[PDB]
Structure formats: C-alpha cells, structure tokens
C-alpha cells in the first residue's frame, strides 16, 4: 500500500541501502561460494536484482517506444522463471561484486527517476501500461514494489544468512 511517489521512493531507498550495505564485508574471493541451504551465492544474489530491476525498466522502455512487450522476457515465460534466472546469472555473473553493486545502484537510481516522471494515475491506477496488465488489474507501483522493496528485503535475509554460514 502506497499513497505517494515520495513514500514509494523512500521505502525503496530504505530497503535498497540496507541490502547493498551487507555486501561491504564480503570478499571478492568468496563471491561464488555455494553455502549449505542458502540457494544463491553473493554474485548470484546481486545478478538476480540486476535481472529483474533492469527487466522492469526495459518493459517500460519498450512500451513507451511503441514496442510489444513480451513478459517476462522474449523467449522466456512466467512458468519458467528458473530459466529466466539462469539468463540473469549468465548475463551479470561475469562482473565482480563491486561491479554488480555499482550497476545495481545505477539501475535503482533509474527507478527513482522513472517514478518521478510517471503521472499519479500512471503510477497508481490500473489500465495505464500494457506490460502491467500481465497480471490483471495491477497498477505499475505494485510491479515496482515486488521488484525492489520486496526482494531487497527478502534477499537481505539471504545474504546475511550466507555470511553467517560461509566457511573460513
Ligand atoms: Cl539465497
Ligand atoms: K556465483
């Protein structure tokens, strides 16, 4: 539930900064370590955010340029997000933690900029984006929440757990 652009932007920033801050103490040498019962490495964790946040921005970019938007992505389907994630890991996994963090910070700033340029109705009322219709009656802000606030929260838990369990 969000009432304003300011409220949404502030919640994204709050959850994003707590998430990113967890990577400060992680060694580059350990970025690919798979730890027991933790589904992703630090590098995979970041690549997942880079994937969805950039995909969100790309949906909007395609639609306002007048293009059809295949969601989640061309060649990928909602019933096979695992394959989509694999494309994320492959795409962003060739970069360091430092590099992935910088990219993600830039992508989140683009989200701030996007929210600012939306009209109130475009952000908060359904029926304004074709790409948002992918889930019936969801306004854009919901799509933004579930790809920023929500995963920055959940995957902060995952990366903290990774740090609790990673071997010396
Ligand atoms: Cl994980
Ligand atoms: K990895």
mmCIF file with all atom_site columns, C-alpha atoms and ligand atoms in Angstrom:
data_model
loop_
_atom_site.group_PDB
_atom_site.id
_atom_site.type_symbol
_atom_site.label_atom_id
_atom_site.label_alt_id
_atom_site.label_comp_id
_atom_site.label_asym_id
_atom_site.label_entity_id
_atom_site.label_seq_id
_atom_site.pdbx_PDB_ins_code
_atom_site.Cartn_x
_atom_site.Cartn_y
_atom_site.Cartn_z
_atom_site.occupancy
_atom_site.B_iso_or_equiv
_atom_site.pdbx_formal_charge
_atom_site.auth_seq_id
_atom_site.auth_comp_id
_atom_site.auth_asym_id
_atom_site.auth_atom_id
_atom_site.pdbx_PDB_model_num
ATOM   1   C  CA  . UNK A 1 1   ? 0.000  0.000   0.000   1.00 0.00 ? 1   UNK A CA  1
ATOM   2   C  CA  . UNK A 1 2   ? 1.464  3.333   -1.161  1.00 0.00 ? 2   UNK A CA  1
ATOM   3   C  CA  . UNK A 1 3   ? -0.121 6.810   -1.161  1.00 0.00 ? 3   UNK A CA  1
ATOM   4   C  CA  . UNK A 1 4   ? 2.582  8.871   -2.894  1.00 0.00 ? 4   UNK A CA  1
ATOM   5   C  CA  . UNK A 1 5   ? 5.707  8.861   -5.074  1.00 0.00 ? 5   UNK A CA  1
ATOM   6   C  CA  . UNK A 1 6   ? 7.721  10.092  -2.110  1.00 0.00 ? 6   UNK A CA  1
ATOM   7   C  CA  . UNK A 1 7   ? 6.504  7.214   0.070   1.00 0.00 ? 7   UNK A CA  1
ATOM   8   C  CA  . UNK A 1 8   ? 7.413  4.624   -2.564  1.00 0.00 ? 8   UNK A CA  1
ATOM   9   C  CA  . UNK A 1 9   ? 10.806 6.129   -3.364  1.00 0.00 ? 9   UNK A CA  1
ATOM   10  C  CA  . UNK A 1 10  ? 11.695 6.370   0.330   1.00 0.00 ? 10  UNK A CA  1
ATOM   11  C  CA  . UNK A 1 11  ? 10.745 2.746   1.008   1.00 0.00 ? 11  UNK A CA  1
ATOM   12  C  CA  . UNK A 1 12  ? 12.777 1.539   -1.964  1.00 0.00 ? 12  UNK A CA  1
ATOM   13  C  CA  . UNK A 1 13  ? 15.771 3.553   -0.793  1.00 0.00 ? 13  UNK A CA  1
ATOM   14  C  CA  . UNK A 1 14  ? 15.381 2.320   2.780   1.00 0.00 ? 14  UNK A CA  1
ATOM   15  C  CA  . UNK A 1 15  ? 15.301 -1.340  1.774   1.00 0.00 ? 15  UNK A CA  1
ATOM   16  C  CA  . UNK A 1 16  ? 17.856 -0.979  -1.043  1.00 0.00 ? 16  UNK A CA  1
ATOM   17  C  CA  . UNK A 1 17  ? 20.508 0.679   1.143   1.00 0.00 ? 17  UNK A CA  1
ATOM   18  C  CA  . UNK A 1 18  ? 20.138 -1.961  3.869   1.00 0.00 ? 18  UNK A CA  1
ATOM   19  C  CA  . UNK A 1 19  ? 20.563 -4.642  1.223   1.00 0.00 ? 19  UNK A CA  1
ATOM   20  C  CA  . UNK A 1 20  ? 23.569 -3.170  -0.553  1.00 0.00 ? 20  UNK A CA  1
ATOM   21  C  CA  . UNK A 1 21  ? 25.314 -2.415  2.752   1.00 0.00 ? 21  UNK A CA  1
ATOM   22  C  CA  . UNK A 1 22  ? 25.525 -6.140  3.535   1.00 0.00 ? 22  UNK A CA  1
ATOM   23  C  CA  . UNK A 1 23  ? 27.986 -6.665  0.681   1.00 0.00 ? 23  UNK A CA  1
ATOM   24  C  CA  . UNK A 1 24  ? 30.630 -4.302  2.086   1.00 0.00 ? 24  UNK A CA  1
ATOM   25  C  CA  . UNK A 1 25  ? 32.277 -7.030  4.214   1.00 0.00 ? 25  UNK A CA  1
ATOM   26  C  CA  . UNK A 1 26  ? 32.101 -9.767  1.580   1.00 0.00 ? 26  UNK A CA  1
ATOM   27  C  CA  . UNK A 1 27  ? 35.382 -10.737 -0.070  1.00 0.00 ? 27  UNK A CA  1
ATOM   28  C  CA  . UNK A 1 28  ? 35.559 -10.810 -3.860  1.00 0.00 ? 28  UNK A CA  1
ATOM   29  C  CA  . UNK A 1 29  ? 37.345 -14.141 -3.460  1.00 0.00 ? 29  UNK A CA  1
ATOM   30  C  CA  . UNK A 1 30  ? 34.199 -15.652 -1.929  1.00 0.00 ? 30  UNK A CA  1
ATOM   31  C  CA  . UNK A 1 31  ? 31.628 -14.219 -4.329  1.00 0.00 ? 31  UNK A CA  1
ATOM   32  C  CA  . UNK A 1 32  ? 30.817 -17.604 -5.878  1.00 0.00 ? 32  UNK A CA  1
ATOM   33  C  CA  . UNK A 1 33  ? 30.794 -19.814 -2.775  1.00 0.00 ? 33  UNK A CA  1
ATOM   34  C  CA  . UNK A 1 34  ? 27.705 -22.003 -2.515  1.00 0.00 ? 34  UNK A CA  1
ATOM   35  C  CA  . UNK A 1 35  ? 26.773 -22.343 1.160   1.00 0.00 ? 35  UNK A CA  1
ATOM   36  C  CA  . UNK A 1 36  ? 24.576 -25.154 2.552   1.00 0.00 ? 36  UNK A CA  1
ATOM   37  C  CA  . UNK A 1 37  ? 20.800 -24.376 2.496   1.00 0.00 ? 37  UNK A CA  1
ATOM   38  C  CA  . UNK A 1 38  ? 21.429 -20.906 1.027   1.00 0.00 ? 38  UNK A CA  1
ATOM   39  C  CA  . UNK A 1 39  ? 20.123 -21.002 -2.548  1.00 0.00 ? 39  UNK A CA  1
ATOM   40  C  CA  . UNK A 1 40  ? 22.357 -18.276 -4.035  1.00 0.00 ? 40  UNK A CA  1
ATOM   41  C  CA  . UNK A 1 41  ? 25.928 -17.005 -3.844  1.00 0.00 ? 41  UNK A CA  1
ATOM   42  C  CA  . UNK A 1 42  ? 26.586 -13.288 -3.266  1.00 0.00 ? 42  UNK A CA  1
ATOM   43  C  CA  . UNK A 1 43  ? 27.228 -12.849 -7.009  1.00 0.00 ? 43  UNK A CA  1
ATOM   44  C  CA  . UNK A 1 44  ? 24.020 -14.738 -7.899  1.00 0.00 ? 44  UNK A CA  1
ATOM   45  C  CA  . UNK A 1 45  ? 22.106 -12.674 -5.336  1.00 0.00 ? 45  UNK A CA  1
ATOM   46  C  CA  . UNK A 1 46  ? 23.154 -9.427  -6.962  1.00 0.00 ? 46  UNK A CA  1
ATOM   47  C  CA  . UNK A 1 47  ? 22.613 -10.812 -10.503 1.00 0.00 ? 47  UNK A CA  1
ATOM   48  C  CA  . UNK A 1 48  ? 19.028 -11.644 -9.562  1.00 0.00 ? 48  UNK A CA  1
ATOM   49  C  CA  . UNK A 1 49  ? 18.314 -7.994  -8.665  1.00 0.00 ? 49  UNK A CA  1
ATOM   50  C  CA  . UNK A 1 50  ? 20.109 -6.714  -11.725 1.00 0.00 ? 50  UNK A CA  1
ATOM   51  C  CA  . UNK A 1 51  ? 17.972 -9.060  -13.782 1.00 0.00 ? 51  UNK A CA  1
ATOM   52  C  CA  . UNK A 1 52  ? 14.537 -8.043  -12.531 1.00 0.00 ? 52  UNK A CA  1
ATOM   53  C  CA  . UNK A 1 53  ? 15.179 -4.349  -11.956 1.00 0.00 ? 53  UNK A CA  1
ATOM   54  C  CA  . UNK A 1 54  ? 16.609 -3.958  -15.444 1.00 0.00 ? 54  UNK A CA  1
ATOM   55  C  CA  . UNK A 1 55  ? 13.776 -6.063  -16.919 1.00 0.00 ? 55  UNK A CA  1
ATOM   56  C  CA  . UNK A 1 56  ? 11.196 -3.796  -15.268 1.00 0.00 ? 56  UNK A CA  1
ATOM   57  C  CA  . UNK A 1 57  ? 12.886 -0.728  -16.754 1.00 0.00 ? 57  UNK A CA  1
ATOM   58  C  CA  . UNK A 1 58  ? 13.096 -2.486  -20.138 1.00 0.00 ? 58  UNK A CA  1
ATOM   59  C  CA  . UNK A 1 59  ? 9.350  -3.265  -20.154 1.00 0.00 ? 59  UNK A CA  1
ATOM   60  C  CA  . UNK A 1 60  ? 8.609  0.419   -19.722 1.00 0.00 ? 60  UNK A CA  1
ATOM   61  C  CA  . UNK A 1 61  ? 11.255 1.474   -22.263 1.00 0.00 ? 61  UNK A CA  1
ATOM   62  C  CA  . UNK A 1 62  ? 9.841  -0.859  -24.909 1.00 0.00 ? 62  UNK A CA  1
ATOM   63  C  CA  . UNK A 1 63  ? 6.237  0.110   -24.309 1.00 0.00 ? 63  UNK A CA  1
ATOM   64  C  CA  . UNK A 1 64  ? 6.661  3.883   -24.427 1.00 0.00 ? 64  UNK A CA  1
ATOM   65  C  CA  . UNK A 1 65  ? 8.769  3.453   -27.595 1.00 0.00 ? 65  UNK A CA  1
ATOM   66  C  CA  . UNK A 1 66  ? 5.746  1.691   -29.094 1.00 0.00 ? 66  UNK A CA  1
ATOM   67  C  CA  . UNK A 1 67  ? 7.025  -1.904  -28.979 1.00 0.00 ? 67  UNK A CA  1
ATOM   68  C  CA  . UNK A 1 68  ? 5.246  -5.076  -27.956 1.00 0.00 ? 68  UNK A CA  1
ATOM   69  C  CA  . UNK A 1 69  ? 6.430  -6.208  -24.542 1.00 0.00 ? 69  UNK A CA  1
ATOM   70  C  CA  . UNK A 1 70  ? 6.839  -9.940  -24.101 1.00 0.00 ? 70  UNK A CA  1
ATOM   71  C  CA  . UNK A 1 71  ? 6.902  -10.551 -20.356 1.00 0.00 ? 71  UNK A CA  1
ATOM   72  C  CA  . UNK A 1 72  ? 8.941  -11.538 -18.510 1.00 0.00 ? 72  UNK A CA  1
ATOM   73  C  CA  . UNK A 1 73  ? 11.288 -11.507 -21.497 1.00 0.00 ? 73  UNK A CA  1
ATOM   74  C  CA  . UNK A 1 74  ? 11.363 -12.627 -25.131 1.00 0.00 ? 74  UNK A CA  1
ATOM   75  C  CA  . UNK A 1 75  ? 11.999 -16.371 -25.222 1.00 0.00 ? 75  UNK A CA  1
ATOM   76  C  CA  . UNK A 1 76  ? 11.124 -16.727 -21.549 1.00 0.00 ? 76  UNK A CA  1
ATOM   77  C  CA  . UNK A 1 77  ? 7.835  -17.489 -19.826 1.00 0.00 ? 77  UNK A CA  1
ATOM   78  C  CA  . UNK A 1 78  ? 6.289  -16.916 -16.397 1.00 0.00 ? 78  UNK A CA  1
ATOM   79  C  CA  . UNK A 1 79  ? 6.049  -20.668 -15.755 1.00 0.00 ? 79  UNK A CA  1
ATOM   80  C  CA  . UNK A 1 80  ? 9.809  -20.988 -16.283 1.00 0.00 ? 80  UNK A CA  1
ATOM   81  C  CA  . UNK A 1 81  ? 11.332 -18.223 -14.160 1.00 0.00 ? 81  UNK A CA  1
ATOM   82  C  CA  . UNK A 1 82  ? 14.148 -20.649 -13.342 1.00 0.00 ? 82  UNK A CA  1
ATOM   83  C  CA  . UNK A 1 83  ? 15.284 -20.412 -16.949 1.00 0.00 ? 83  UNK A CA  1
ATOM   84  C  CA  . UNK A 1 84  ? 14.927 -16.643 -16.737 1.00 0.00 ? 84  UNK A CA  1
ATOM   85  C  CA  . UNK A 1 85  ? 17.035 -16.569 -13.572 1.00 0.00 ? 85  UNK A CA  1
ATOM   86  C  CA  . UNK A 1 86  ? 19.643 -18.689 -15.334 1.00 0.00 ? 86  UNK A CA  1
ATOM   87  C  CA  . UNK A 1 87  ? 19.759 -15.988 -18.026 1.00 0.00 ? 87  UNK A CA  1
ATOM   88  C  CA  . UNK A 1 88  ? 20.233 -13.423 -15.251 1.00 0.00 ? 88  UNK A CA  1
ATOM   89  C  CA  . UNK A 1 89  ? 23.101 -15.376 -13.652 1.00 0.00 ? 89  UNK A CA  1
ATOM   90  C  CA  . UNK A 1 90  ? 24.769 -15.748 -17.035 1.00 0.00 ? 90  UNK A CA  1
ATOM   91  C  CA  . UNK A 1 91  ? 24.300 -12.113 -18.006 1.00 0.00 ? 91  UNK A CA  1
ATOM   92  C  CA  . UNK A 1 92  ? 25.513 -10.364 -14.866 1.00 0.00 ? 92  UNK A CA  1
ATOM   93  C  CA  . UNK A 1 93  ? 27.659 -13.100 -13.315 1.00 0.00 ? 93  UNK A CA  1
ATOM   94  C  CA  . UNK A 1 94  ? 30.759 -12.125 -15.309 1.00 0.00 ? 94  UNK A CA  1
ATOM   95  C  CA  . UNK A 1 95  ? 31.106 -8.987  -13.184 1.00 0.00 ? 95  UNK A CA  1
ATOM   96  C  CA  . UNK A 1 96  ? 32.668 -8.546  -9.741  1.00 0.00 ? 96  UNK A CA  1
ATOM   97  C  CA  . UNK A 1 97  ? 30.702 -7.757  -6.598  1.00 0.00 ? 97  UNK A CA  1
ATOM   98  C  CA  . UNK A 1 98  ? 31.986 -4.204  -6.848  1.00 0.00 ? 98  UNK A CA  1
ATOM   99  C  CA  . UNK A 1 99  ? 30.890 -4.019  -10.482 1.00 0.00 ? 99  UNK A CA  1
ATOM   100 C  CA  . UNK A 1 100 ? 27.462 -5.640  -9.860  1.00 0.00 ? 100 UNK A CA  1
ATOM   101 C  CA  . UNK A 1 101 ? 26.847 -3.289  -6.906  1.00 0.00 ? 101 UNK A CA  1
ATOM   102 C  CA  . UNK A 1 102 ? 27.639 -0.205  -8.983  1.00 0.00 ? 102 UNK A CA  1
ATOM   103 C  CA  . UNK A 1 103 ? 25.349 -1.378  -11.776 1.00 0.00 ? 103 UNK A CA  1
ATOM   104 C  CA  . UNK A 1 104 ? 22.527 -2.095  -9.339  1.00 0.00 ? 104 UNK A CA  1
ATOM   105 C  CA  . UNK A 1 105 ? 22.924 1.286   -7.689  1.00 0.00 ? 105 UNK A CA  1
ATOM   106 C  CA  . UNK A 1 106 ? 22.608 2.881   -11.120 1.00 0.00 ? 106 UNK A CA  1
ATOM   107 C  CA  . UNK A 1 107 ? 19.542 0.786   -12.005 1.00 0.00 ? 107 UNK A CA  1
ATOM   108 C  CA  . UNK A 1 108 ? 17.795 1.715   -8.763  1.00 0.00 ? 108 UNK A CA  1
ATOM   109 C  CA  . UNK A 1 109 ? 18.501 5.382   -9.444  1.00 0.00 ? 109 UNK A CA  1
ATOM   110 C  CA  . UNK A 1 110 ? 16.774 4.889   -12.800 1.00 0.00 ? 110 UNK A CA  1
ATOM   111 C  CA  . UNK A 1 111 ? 13.772 3.550   -10.936 1.00 0.00 ? 111 UNK A CA  1
ATOM   112 C  CA  . UNK A 1 112 ? 13.697 6.709   -8.774  1.00 0.00 ? 112 UNK A CA  1
ATOM   113 C  CA  . UNK A 1 113 ? 13.803 8.781   -11.966 1.00 0.00 ? 113 UNK A CA  1
ATOM   114 C  CA  . UNK A 1 114 ? 11.051 6.716   -13.562 1.00 0.00 ? 114 UNK A CA  1
ATOM   115 C  CA  . UNK A 1 115 ? 8.699  7.070   -10.570 1.00 0.00 ? 115 UNK A CA  1
ATOM   116 C  CA  . UNK A 1 116 ? 9.241  10.818  -10.663 1.00 0.00 ? 116 UNK A CA  1
ATOM   117 C  CA  . UNK A 1 117 ? 8.237  11.092  -14.339 1.00 0.00 ? 117 UNK A CA  1
ATOM   118 C  CA  . UNK A 1 118 ? 5.085  8.999   -14.065 1.00 0.00 ? 118 UNK A CA  1
ATOM   119 C  CA  . UNK A 1 119 ? 1.789  10.754  -13.656 1.00 0.00 ? 119 UNK A CA  1
ATOM   120 C  CA  . UNK A 1 120 ? -0.024 9.949   -10.425 1.00 0.00 ? 120 UNK A CA  1
ATOM   121 C  CA  . UNK A 1 121 ? -2.565 7.907   -12.387 1.00 0.00 ? 121 UNK A CA  1
ATOM   122 C  CA  . UNK A 1 122 ? 0.084  6.053   -14.397 1.00 0.00 ? 122 UNK A CA  1
ATOM   123 C  CA  . UNK A 1 123 ? 1.766  5.018   -11.179 1.00 0.00 ? 123 UNK A CA  1
ATOM   124 C  CA  . UNK A 1 124 ? -1.253 4.229   -9.033  1.00 0.00 ? 124 UNK A CA  1
ATOM   125 C  CA  . UNK A 1 125 ? -4.199 3.283   -11.282 1.00 0.00 ? 125 UNK A CA  1
ATOM   126 C  CA  . UNK A 1 126 ? -4.566 0.172   -13.452 1.00 0.00 ? 126 UNK A CA  1
ATOM   127 C  CA  . UNK A 1 127 ? -5.177 0.383   -17.190 1.00 0.00 ? 127 UNK A CA  1
ATOM   128 C  CA  . UNK A 1 128 ? -2.171 2.608   -17.977 1.00 0.00 ? 128 UNK A CA  1
ATOM   129 C  CA  . UNK A 1 129 ? 0.501  0.145   -19.129 1.00 0.00 ? 129 UNK A CA  1
ATOM   130 C  CA  . UNK A 1 130 ? 0.046  -2.887  -21.339 1.00 0.00 ? 130 UNK A CA  1
ATOM   131 C  CA  . UNK A 1 131 ? 3.044  -4.546  -19.704 1.00 0.00 ? 131 UNK A CA  1
ATOM   132 C  CA  . UNK A 1 132 ? 1.452  -4.153  -16.257 1.00 0.00 ? 132 UNK A CA  1
ATOM   133 C  CA  . UNK A 1 133 ? -1.691 -5.936  -17.494 1.00 0.00 ? 133 UNK A CA  1
ATOM   134 C  CA  . UNK A 1 134 ? 0.332  -9.162  -17.460 1.00 0.00 ? 134 UNK A CA  1
ATOM   135 C  CA  . UNK A 1 135 ? -1.216 -9.577  -14.026 1.00 0.00 ? 135 UNK A CA  1
ATOM   136 C  CA  . UNK A 1 136 ? -4.804 -8.373  -14.282 1.00 0.00 ? 136 UNK A CA  1
ATOM   137 C  CA  . UNK A 1 137 ? -5.623 -5.055  -12.583 1.00 0.00 ? 137 UNK A CA  1
ATOM   138 C  CA  . UNK A 1 138 ? -2.164 -4.475  -11.049 1.00 0.00 ? 138 UNK A CA  1
ATOM   139 C  CA  . UNK A 1 139 ? -1.077 -0.819  -11.135 1.00 0.00 ? 139 UNK A CA  1
ATOM   140 C  CA  . UNK A 1 140 ? 2.552  -0.044  -12.028 1.00 0.00 ? 140 UNK A CA  1
ATOM   141 C  CA  . UNK A 1 141 ? 3.515  0.680   -8.399  1.00 0.00 ? 141 UNK A CA  1
ATOM   142 C  CA  . UNK A 1 142 ? 2.749  -2.926  -7.448  1.00 0.00 ? 142 UNK A CA  1
ATOM   143 C  CA  . UNK A 1 143 ? 5.132  -4.181  -10.116 1.00 0.00 ? 143 UNK A CA  1
ATOM   144 C  CA  . UNK A 1 144 ? 7.740  -1.779  -8.790  1.00 0.00 ? 144 UNK A CA  1
ATOM   145 C  CA  . UNK A 1 145 ? 7.258  -2.876  -5.150  1.00 0.00 ? 145 UNK A CA  1
ATOM   146 C  CA  . UNK A 1 146 ? 7.607  -6.576  -5.945  1.00 0.00 ? 146 UNK A CA  1
ATOM   147 C  CA  . UNK A 1 147 ? 10.851 -5.955  -7.886  1.00 0.00 ? 147 UNK A CA  1
ATOM   148 C  CA  . UNK A 1 148 ? 12.520 -3.598  -5.421  1.00 0.00 ? 148 UNK A CA  1
ATOM   149 C  CA  . UNK A 1 149 ? 11.180 -3.251  -1.883  1.00 0.00 ? 149 UNK A CA  1
ATOM   150 C  CA  . UNK A 1 150 ? 10.115 -6.886  -1.535  1.00 0.00 ? 150 UNK A CA  1
ATOM   151 C  CA  . UNK A 1 151 ? 13.203 -8.616  -2.943  1.00 0.00 ? 151 UNK A CA  1
ATOM   152 C  CA  . UNK A 1 152 ? 15.641 -6.133  -1.344  1.00 0.00 ? 152 UNK A CA  1
ATOM   153 C  CA  . UNK A 1 153 ? 14.082 -7.198  1.969   1.00 0.00 ? 153 UNK A CA  1
ATOM   154 C  CA  . UNK A 1 154 ? 13.967 -10.947 1.327   1.00 0.00 ? 154 UNK A CA  1
ATOM   155 C  CA  . UNK A 1 155 ? 17.368 -11.214 -0.297  1.00 0.00 ? 155 UNK A CA  1
ATOM   156 C  CA  . UNK A 1 156 ? 18.932 -9.150  2.509   1.00 0.00 ? 156 UNK A CA  1
ATOM   157 C  CA  . UNK A 1 157 ? 17.884 -12.054 4.725   1.00 0.00 ? 157 UNK A CA  1
ATOM   158 C  CA  . UNK A 1 158 ? 19.502 -14.496 2.301   1.00 0.00 ? 158 UNK A CA  1
ATOM   159 C  CA  . UNK A 1 159 ? 22.810 -12.623 2.037   1.00 0.00 ? 159 UNK A CA  1
ATOM   160 C  CA  . UNK A 1 160 ? 23.041 -12.177 5.823   1.00 0.00 ? 160 UNK A CA  1
ATOM   161 C  CA  . UNK A 1 161 ? 22.466 -15.937 6.164   1.00 0.00 ? 161 UNK A CA  1
ATOM   162 C  CA  . UNK A 1 162 ? 25.165 -16.596 3.600   1.00 0.00 ? 162 UNK A CA  1
ATOM   163 C  CA  . UNK A 1 163 ? 27.535 -14.536 5.751   1.00 0.00 ? 163 UNK A CA  1
ATOM   164 C  CA  . UNK A 1 164 ? 26.518 -16.468 8.878   1.00 0.00 ? 164 UNK A CA  1
ATOM   165 C  CA  . UNK A 1 165 ? 27.364 -19.781 7.290   1.00 0.00 ? 165 UNK A CA  1
ATOM   166 C  CA  . UNK A 1 166 ? 30.239 -19.228 4.839   1.00 0.00 ? 166 UNK A CA  1
ATOM   167 C  CA  . UNK A 1 167 ? 33.389 -21.237 5.761   1.00 0.00 ? 167 UNK A CA  1
ATOM   168 C  CA  . UNK A 1 168 ? 36.654 -19.502 6.680   1.00 0.00 ? 168 UNK A CA  1
HETATM 169 CL CL1 . LIG B 2 .   ? 19.854 -17.293 -1.319  1.00 0.00 ? 1   LIG B CL1 1
HETATM 170 K  K1  . LIG B 2 .   ? 28.160 -17.089 -8.330  1.00 0.00 ? 2   LIG B K1  1
#
